[PDB]
Amino acid sequence: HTTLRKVTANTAIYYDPNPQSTVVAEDQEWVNVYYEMPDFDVARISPWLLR
């Protein structure tokens, strides 16, 4: 039995005002292409994150 703790390295709660902001610079390259498809984006999205 393995939990997320044993497989996770670090976690943080970042703030992004708009969905396209992605204040984190490193992940901006890959999140953009994935987020192009409006999956769950039919309405407003909270500016919080649980990366």
- Positions touching other proteins (CB under 8 A) are 5, 8-18, 23, 47-48
> In the complex with other proteins, which residue's Cβ is closer, 15 or 40?
15
Least distance between other proteins and beta carbon 35 (Å): 18
Amino acid at 26: E
Least distance between other proteins and beta carbon 1 (Å): 17
CA–CA distance, 23 with 2 (Å, rounded to integer): 31
- Cα angle, residue 24 at apex, residues 4 and 28 outer, rounded to 5°: 95
CA–CA distance, 24 with 16 (Å, rounded to integer): 9
Least distance between other proteins and beta carbon 40 (Å): 19
